[PDB]
Amino acid sequence: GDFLVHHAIALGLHTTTLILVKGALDARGSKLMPDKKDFGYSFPCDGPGRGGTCDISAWDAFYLAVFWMLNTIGWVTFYWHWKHITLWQGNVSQFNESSTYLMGWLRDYLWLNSSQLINGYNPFGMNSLSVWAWMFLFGHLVWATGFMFLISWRGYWQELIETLAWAHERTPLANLIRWKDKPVALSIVQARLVGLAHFSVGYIFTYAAFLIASTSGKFG
Amino acid sequence: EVKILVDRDPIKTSFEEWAKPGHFSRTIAKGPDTTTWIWNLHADAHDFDSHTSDLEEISRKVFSAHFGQLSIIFLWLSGMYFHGARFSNYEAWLSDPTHIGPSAQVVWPIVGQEILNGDVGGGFRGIQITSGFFQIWRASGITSELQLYCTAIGALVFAALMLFAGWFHYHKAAPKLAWFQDVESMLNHHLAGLLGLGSLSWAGHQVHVSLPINQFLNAGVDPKEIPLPHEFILNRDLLAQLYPSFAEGATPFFTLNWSKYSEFLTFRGGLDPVTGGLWLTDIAHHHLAIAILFLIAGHMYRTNWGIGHGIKDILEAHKGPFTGQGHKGLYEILTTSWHAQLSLNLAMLGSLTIIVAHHMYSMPPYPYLATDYATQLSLFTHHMWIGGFLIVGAAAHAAIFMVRDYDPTNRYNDLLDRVLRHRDAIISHLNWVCIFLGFHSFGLYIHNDTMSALGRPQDMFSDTAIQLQPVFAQWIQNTHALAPGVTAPGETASTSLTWGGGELVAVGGKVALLPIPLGTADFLVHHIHAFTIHVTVLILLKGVLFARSSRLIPDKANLGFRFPCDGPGRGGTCQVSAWDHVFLGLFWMYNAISVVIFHFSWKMQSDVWGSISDQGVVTHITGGNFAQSSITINGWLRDFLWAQASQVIQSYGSSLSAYGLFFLGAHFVWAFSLMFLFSGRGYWQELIESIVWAHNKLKVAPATQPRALSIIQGRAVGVTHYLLGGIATTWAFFLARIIAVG
Amino acid sequence: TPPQLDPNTPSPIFAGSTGGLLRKAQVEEFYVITWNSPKEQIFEMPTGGAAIMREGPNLLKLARKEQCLALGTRLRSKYKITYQFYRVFPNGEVQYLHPKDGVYPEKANPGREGVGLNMRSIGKNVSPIEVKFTGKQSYDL
Amino acid sequence: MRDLKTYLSVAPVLSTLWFGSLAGLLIEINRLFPDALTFPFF
Amino acid sequence: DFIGSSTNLIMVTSTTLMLFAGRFGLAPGLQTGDPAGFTLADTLACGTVGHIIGVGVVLGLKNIG
Amino acid sequence: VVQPINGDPFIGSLETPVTSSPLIAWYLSNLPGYRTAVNPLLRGVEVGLAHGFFLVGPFVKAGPLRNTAYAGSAGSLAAAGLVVILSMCLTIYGISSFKEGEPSIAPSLTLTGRKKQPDQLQTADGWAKFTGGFFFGGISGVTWAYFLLYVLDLPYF
Ligand code: CLA
Ligand code: CLA
Numbered sequence A: 001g002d003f004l005v006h007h008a009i010a011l012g013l014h015t016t017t018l019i020l021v022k023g024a025l026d027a028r029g030s031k032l033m034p035d036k037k038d039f040g041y042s043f044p045c046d047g048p049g050r051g052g053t054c055d056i057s058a059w060d061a062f063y064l065a066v067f068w069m070l071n072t073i074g075w076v077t078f079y080w081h082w083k084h085i086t087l088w089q090g091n092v093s094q095f096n097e098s099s100t101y102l103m104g105w106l107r108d109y110l111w112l113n114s115s116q117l118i119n120g121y122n123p124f125g126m127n128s129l130s131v132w133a134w135m136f137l138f139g140h141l142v143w144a145t146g147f148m149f150l151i152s153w154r155g156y157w158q159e160l161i162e163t164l165a166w167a168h169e170r171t172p173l174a175n176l177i178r179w180k181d182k183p184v185a186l187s188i189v190q191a192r193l194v195g196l197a198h199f200s201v202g203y204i205f206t207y208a209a210f211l212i213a214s215t216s217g218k219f220g
Numbered sequence B: 001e002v003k004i005l006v007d008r009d010p011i012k013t014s015f016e017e018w019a020k021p022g023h024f025s026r027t028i029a030k031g032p033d034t035t036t037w038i039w040n041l042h043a044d045a046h047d048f049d050s051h052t053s054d055l056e057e058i059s060r061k062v063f064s065a066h067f068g069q070l071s072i073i074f075l076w077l078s079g080m081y082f083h084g085a086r087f088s089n090y091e092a093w094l095s096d097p098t099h100i101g102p103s104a105q106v107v108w109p110i111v112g113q114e115i116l117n118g119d120v121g122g123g124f125r126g127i128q129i130t131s132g133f134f135q136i137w138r139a140s141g142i143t144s145e146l147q148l149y150c151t152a153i154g155a156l157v158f159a160a161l162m163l164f165a166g167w168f169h170y171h172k173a174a175p176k177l178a179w180f181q182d183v184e185s186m187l188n189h190h191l192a193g194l195l196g197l198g199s200l201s202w203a204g205h206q207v208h209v210s211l212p213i214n215q216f217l218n219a220g221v222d223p224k225e226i227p228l229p230h231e232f233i234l235n236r237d238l239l240a241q242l243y244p245s246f247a248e249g250a251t252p253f254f255t256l257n258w259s260k261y262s263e264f265l266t267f268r269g270g271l272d273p274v275t276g277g278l279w280l281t282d283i284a285h286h287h288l289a290i291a292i293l294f295l296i297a298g299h300m301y302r303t304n305w306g307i308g309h310g311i312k313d314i315l316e317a318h319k320g321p322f323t324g325q326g327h328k329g330l331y332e333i334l335t336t337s338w339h340a341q342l343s344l345n346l347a348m349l350g351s352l353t354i355i356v357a358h359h360m361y362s363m364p365p366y367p368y369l370a371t372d373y374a375t376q377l378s379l380f381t382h383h384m385w386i387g388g389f390l391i392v393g394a395a396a397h398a399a400i401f402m403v404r405d406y407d408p409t410n411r412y413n414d415l416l417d418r419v420l421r422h423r424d425a426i427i428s429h430l431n432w433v434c435i436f437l438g439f440h441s442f443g444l445y446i447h448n449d450t451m452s453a454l455g456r457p458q459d460m461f462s463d464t465a466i467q468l469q470p471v472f473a474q475w476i477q478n479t480h481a482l483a484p485g486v487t488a489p490g491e492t493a494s495t496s497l498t499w500g501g502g503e504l505v506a507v508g509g510k511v512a513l514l515p516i517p518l519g520t521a522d523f524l525v526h527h528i529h530a531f532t533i534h535v536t537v538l539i540l541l542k543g544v545l546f547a548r549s550s551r552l553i554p555d556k557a558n559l560g561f562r563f564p565c566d567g568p569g570r571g572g573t574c575q576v577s578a579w580d581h582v583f584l585g586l587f588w589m590y591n592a593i594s595v596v597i598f599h600f601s602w603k604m605q606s607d608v609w610g611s612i613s614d615q616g617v618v619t620h621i622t623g624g625n626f627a628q629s630s631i632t633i634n635g636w637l638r639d640f641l642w643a644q645a646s647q648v649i650q651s652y653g654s655s656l657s658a659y660g661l662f663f664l665g666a667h668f669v670w671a672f673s674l675m676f677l678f679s680g681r682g683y684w685q686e687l688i689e690s691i692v693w694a695h696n697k698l699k700v701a702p703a704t705q706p707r708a709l710s711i712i713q714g715r716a717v718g719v720t721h722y723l724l725g726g727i728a729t730t731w732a733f734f735l736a737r738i739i740a741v742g
Numbered sequence C: 001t002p003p004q005l006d007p008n009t010p011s012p013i014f015a016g017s018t019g020g021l022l023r024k025a026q027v028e029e030f031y032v033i034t035w036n037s038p039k040e041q042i043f044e045m046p047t048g049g050a051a052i053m054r055e056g057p058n059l060l061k062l063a064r065k066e067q068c069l070a071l072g073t074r075l076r077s078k079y080k081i082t083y084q085f086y087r088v089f090p091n092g093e094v095q096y097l098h099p100k101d102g103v104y105p106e107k108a109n110p111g112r113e114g115v116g117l118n119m120r121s122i123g124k125n126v127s128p129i130e131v132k133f134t135g136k137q138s139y140d141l
Numbered sequence D: 001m002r003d004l005k006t007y008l009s010v011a012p013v014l015s016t017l018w019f020g021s022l023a024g025l026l027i028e029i030n031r032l033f034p035d036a037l038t039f040p041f042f
Numbered sequence E: 001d002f003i004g005s006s007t008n009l010i011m012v013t014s015t016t017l018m019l020f021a022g023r024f025g026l027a028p029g030l031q032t033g034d035p036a037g038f039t040l041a042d043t044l045a046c047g048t049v050g051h052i053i054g055v056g057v058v059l060g061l062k063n064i065g
Numbered sequence F: 001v002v003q004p005i006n007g008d009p010f011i012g013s014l015e016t017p018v019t020s021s022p023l024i025a026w027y028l029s030n031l032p033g034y035r036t037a038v039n040p041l042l043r044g045v046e047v048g049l050a051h052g053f054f055l056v057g058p059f060v061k062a063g064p065l066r067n068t069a070y071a072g073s074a075g076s077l078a079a080a081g082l083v084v085i086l087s088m089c090l091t092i093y094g095i096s097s098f099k100e101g102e103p104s105i106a107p108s109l110t111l112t113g114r115k116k117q118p119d120q121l122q123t124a125d126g127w128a129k130f131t132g133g134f135f136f137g138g139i140s141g142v143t144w145a146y147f148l149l150y151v152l153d154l155p156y157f
């Protein structure tokens, strides 16, 4: 299991490296956009022409590499925490027989060690791990909210906020109130950043909650 | 008049167009300059409105395509009936339809997959099916594998028949536009003949086959020594001993003495206590009455003679209090746009599929369906997903109508113009009610989480806390529990037992639909459902209304229905197309139907499904934890997702290992989709050009130039893998759980 | 050429929509398009819906230039009429906008000058290090 | 048959034929030599 | 059947009154010898509707009274 | 029954039976948000009274200790806190929008077209008077409803 997860780790390092090195060396230009240096580091795209140039910047390479990085560190830390919680419990045989197949990671690590966590507040009471259950669900919520900005892109939101601006300018007793900053939707590269920020905040908070609650619910 | 209006041999049957690929268009019938050619070939494969710009050829194409789809459905039915014939325990299920898992699939013992053949029961090692086909076959009185085999050969015959019919109605003798554009005849026939005589002949089957055989099976009879249906038809003494109403004949019918036919066409409301399904006498009376209804309904429109209605004559003469001067021109757009009709028909067909799910869980029409909890869960889940998908397709095709098949110059409608004019009021108020609903449902859930985490369960939204009781649904349950006594005296019991009363139709050690209570959690989750539905409607109706023009892109109908964007300008126009709106409404349909089926599975596993003891107290699967745990998201994570997904992780080993496997793989593909939704074509094209350099350096450069997926195609692949992985995760979870507990 | 001097000409027959001049006309510039239609006919206006432009001169006030030019291209391609739109600031000073020489911009009229034009290939632009700590960018030398 | 051999020469038809043959080969090998984890034939 | 009974009388009268309401009354090719319209399709239509009314009234009379 | 806005069919609205009915145009014109002739302070007092008189309801009957003895005594303090929040909100709004001395940004003329005087609410000093009126009237209404909840006997909400 340590072999297999070390090769998963190698996959993560090599792939994050691939994305980042590819964005660094294609930062000055490529065959699809040889004038990329003139557009700066962070720019949205180069339009739909030439087939489509979504996420072509080196910033976008970074932004996808943060996903692959968080995946890589999630692997290294899942490996660490399960190996160590099985060492601390005593049953190293659990990891040695269960780390070689992924339903062992889903059952004997994520499902098993998250019982005392998600029972931080049940209908009939709560315990000291209530904050970690709440933070667990909070990290889930923002990790999912990042998907709004990553999956759902602009254009739908500008054409929504146009309707909202109409409604505010035609709603009685709110024509009195008018913005000073015209409420546009988030920019594209900005929304990739915001989705990545929600995503990473949720990743980090979720795993912090799970890794502290499970390791503090029993303490080895 | 409504003539036949066909032409002979419009298209030559040949494999010449099989050879040249992408023949059906101008920009694809040249050959692959790139690898985008393949994707654009499959994408525009059934876009018949793009191939040929006339409704005649389009209509012939979709007609023969419907014939191909019917051939496929008949072939699939032949497969199911045949797998029920030769690869099933249908006899052993008939002998004991409470402890024998319905199984009609056996795997081959090759790489250890033979363990998927489980101890379902009946001396049979196979996969426990969940299609409820065994329940249909007991509702039809089959009782033999010979009958399943011969109807499988018949369905193969009908598949060949439909394939030949598609070939004939495209290539040899195809209708022209005067045949499709007449719709009074199409409606008259699809009402009186398809749905009218269809229900009539099914009522005939039931009156002559299902009722006697099911009465015999309910009385207790080995299905081998049961008389065949043709013995009930021919031997009058037999069916007369079953129902003496047959002894008089049809002079009860023709003299309108139907009161004596109330031995086999009862209005006996409620469920059959012996088998947990509905009363097949009630169902035979149902299909008969529905046949009379649709038969008198299919004589409403004027086709060829003087009597009838014109749909144009109705719509152009329908003045009323709220914009009744409109409705003029709808006969024009609906008889000249297949996309309008496809949108409308998909909307109503998907809503009917959802109605079907909701009426099959609660009024289980087949015998021993309510106690096969896998069958009930799978049917509700399935038809819910199908309904949501079909509604989202209604969106897609409403949008495709709005872009392509919409001409205010020729085909003008007052109502659609009035909707497009104030469309911003529509989307603004719908956005508002979506925000309001998201808050006052999900924020109630968040308040519950916070209060239960702060140790303040007195401040939660629950029955033991601040109560948000569904007074209206509770009142409806109170009425319908008391309906058959005063309002519907012809019914001895209520239409369903989900309302209330001392009615709990257990067939064995299983419940089968006790009265479902409605507490604070049901209010909360029903408002979550209204919420998710309203957000789906927001996204989809918004794409529909803004398919043509907006304040952002006033020339969107020139860009097309399915285009990525209009560039990063105007801040950005990334998902401005109507295609992008249906692509997002797919995610929201996923969220909606997933929380719907979660509500269903938990509510039934906590308040309905369970065991019944010899003392008379019911022990549910989860144990009534829906009213206290399904008020918090931590309870959905703990008492539902973490708790019920124990059987799918312990599935490894027993038959359900595949459901274990299909859990994780589904978990993967969903995540695999996130490679597509989050990313963009530019990065992947540059990675591909580096790999193309690596291939040019070995003389292995392809001629079909490798291009990253189209932006729209990246989004399509993303939403496709996302729906597949999420839905297959839920399918594995549901089926493993409910086959391992009930 | 002299501009066309926007008069108070009539407007199309439209029942009103939620796509008009909200606040970008009250405090900022809004736009106005004039087209001579030979006959009265129906057309899909860019603010959503369908209006009926009158015979002879018509005038439609729109919120931004893209609405005006989208409608103008649809007019010139579908109804083959000659459009020309303006920009009217909320204090006045109506600006003639679309043709700017009488002839449409796809035709190389003389007199209009070269502005936004680099006499080099696109990949001979200097790198950002050359223009670093300078107000100029890599595409303005 | 002319232009049927061109259709059967097309990439998906040819891929499904090749992978059906190949999958049947692997399947029948695993029937003949099931549960293999070493190559002991040298 | 059983000609002369109530079930026959209040069905015959319904069928004939619907044929009359279509012939000389408010209710509504195929050139028949009839003076004013009322083709075979209209005849079958009025017969069908009169049978509808007849079934309805005979069974409303058999339910009560 | 539906009519384009003021006859003008190219402004983003419509004269409907909801926004243009005489009952609505009498109601939505004679309420303190649209009393454009009176000084902003009196109408701001009316707005604050109307918003503080009811804001105590949610805080007193649904608050964190509504089931204790300090139900109204704390819900009214919470409503006064929300009034002290919202007067601050209006204050920063008037500061960011109107600087010190500019003329009114309000609609100059009415629907008919007569040269109505500009609404002084949309000025700096005018919105400042509106802020003061809202604060005073809001604390006034909160304390008045606190008086009424324990003085006058109701079956409550
Ligand atoms: C063997 C008999 C035969 C022959 C030689 C032809 C020949 C032709 N047909 Mg006809 N056709 C036939 C049978 C036949 N057809 C039948 C049985 C139907 C009814 C469905 C039709 C309906 C039909 C329509 C509606 C149209 C044609 C058209 C054409 C032409 C283009 C063919 C092409 O490129 O598509 C080759 C395509 C295939 C081989 C794909 C087969 C798809 C089948 C039906 C469904 C299989 C789905 C499968 C079960 C699900 C996928 C599973 C997978 C994921 C594993 C060509 C002249 C087109 C034409 O001339 O218009 C310009 C046209 O529009 N045909
Ligand atoms: C009362 C006669 C009648 C009946 C029964 C039907 C039945 C059907 N029609 Mg409709 N149709 C009719 C008259 C009728 N039609 C008329 C008069 C017109 C011209 C206005 C049309 C025009 C029309 C179109 C344009 C389309 C249909 C389609 C369909 C099918 C929808 C799929 C379905 O529900 O599957 C239920 C499946 C079955 C009941 C199995 C069918 C098996 C039998 C053999 C066929 C039904 C009888 C049929 C009319 C053929 C008569 C004999 C033939 C040799 C001449 C369904 C089979 C759609 C379709 O699926 O395309 C193929 C479609 O696209 N029909």
Ligand code: CLA
Binding pocket: B042, B043, B044, B045, B046, B047, B048, B342, B346, B389, B390, B391, B392, B393, B394, B396, B397, B400, B561, B562, B579, B582, B583, B586, B720, B724
């Ligand atoms: C009655 C049902 C019906 C009908 C007749 C149509 C017909 C059509 N649709 Mg609509 N549609 C429907 C339902 C329907 N759709 C539903 C339910 C949805 C919601 C998802 C949509 C959403 C939709 C969109 C968003 C678009 C269309 C488009 C089209 C057109 C071209 C489709 C094409 O060529 O793809 C040919 C077929 C394919 C490319 C195959 C699709 C592969 C699917 C998605 C994968 C799923 C298969 C399976 C479940 C997964 C496991 C597979 C396994 C092998 C691993 C055609 C007019 C397109 C159009 O008109 O644009 C101009 C378009 O953009 N449809």
Ligand code: CLA
Binding pocket: A141, A144, A145, A147, A148, A151, A152, A156, B430, B431, B432, B434, B435, B436, B437, B438, B439, B442, B443, B446, B535, B538, B539, B584, B585, B587, B588
């Ligand atoms: C959990 C993840 C998540 C969340 C919370 C949201 C939230 C939202 N989406 Mg998004 N979306 C997501 C994932 C998510 N989305 C994904 C993955 C997709 C993929 C396609 C989309 C696609 C999408 C579209 C296409 C649309 C939305 C819409 C909406 C809104 C509808 C509900 C609403 O406003 O009610 C109120 C807000 C909520 C229910 C959100 C949660 C907030 C909770 C209730 C508590 C708030 C606490 C309070 C404010 C205190 C804050 C702290 C303080 C310190 C300030 C809302 C902003 C719709 C929209 O914007 O129009 C209405 C819409 O059209 N979403």
Ligand code: CLA
Binding pocket: B110, B111, B112, D026, D029, D030, D034, D035, D036, D037, D038
């Ligand atoms: C990439 C990772 C990987 C690896 C290394 C393996 C490796 C293996 N798997 Mg696993 N497997 C994998 C992924 C992997 N699998 C995945 C992703 C799945 C899910 C789809 C499975 C599912 C799975 C199952 C369910 C089973 C295996 C089995 C096996 C074994 C194969 C035995 C066999 O039939 O080969 C025998 C050799 C061949 C088929 C090759 C024959 C090639 C032809 C005949 C040409 C060779 C001759 C040629 C002409 C040269 C001669 C030289 C000269 C004279 C010319 C082997 C240990 C089986 C097993 O025994 O379990 C251990 C088994 O039951 N695997």
Ligand code: CLA
Binding pocket: B439, B440, B441, B442, B443, B444, B446, B447, B450, B451, B456, B459, B466, F055, F058, F059, F062, F063, F064, F065
């Ligand atoms: C959005 C859903 C929702 C709802 C309904 C509630 C409701 C409540 N929360 Mg909870 N809460 C939520 C989400 C929600 N919460 C979330 C998302 C979080 C965490 C992010 C919390 C965290 C939380 C804590 C930590 C606490 C509460 C508390 C409370 C209570 C007091 C609120 C208060 O101070 O009253 C103030 C309320 C108002 C000012 C509302 C006025 C709205 C009016 C009624 C609207 C009227 C509109 C009108 C009909 C318009 C048309 C008419 C007009 C034209 C006249 C109340 C029961 C407290 C508690 O425990 O008490 C039980 C508490 O301490 N909440």
Ligand SMILES: CC1=C(C/C=C(\C)CCC[C@H](C)CCC[C@H](C)CCCC(C)C)C(=O)c2ccccc2C1=O
Binding pocket: A054, B675, B676, B677, B679, B680, B681, B682, B684, B685, B707, B708, B709, B710, B711, B713, B714, B715
């Ligand atoms: C992964 C990814 C890609 C790269 C995906 C590739 C190019 C498509 C997958 C193509 C397959 C792998 C091609 C090989 C199949 C051939 C038919 C060859 C068969 C022969 C053997 C391999 C069997 C994108 O182009 C993209 C574009 C826009 C947004 C997101 C993404 C995105 O996430």
Ligand code: SF4
Binding pocket: A044, A045, A046, A047, A048, A052, A053, A054, A055, A153, A188, B564, B565, B566, B567, B568, B569, B572, B573, B574, B575, B680, B711
């Ligand atoms: S979809 Fe967005 S990121 Fe992609 S090309 Fe268009 S504007 Fe650029």
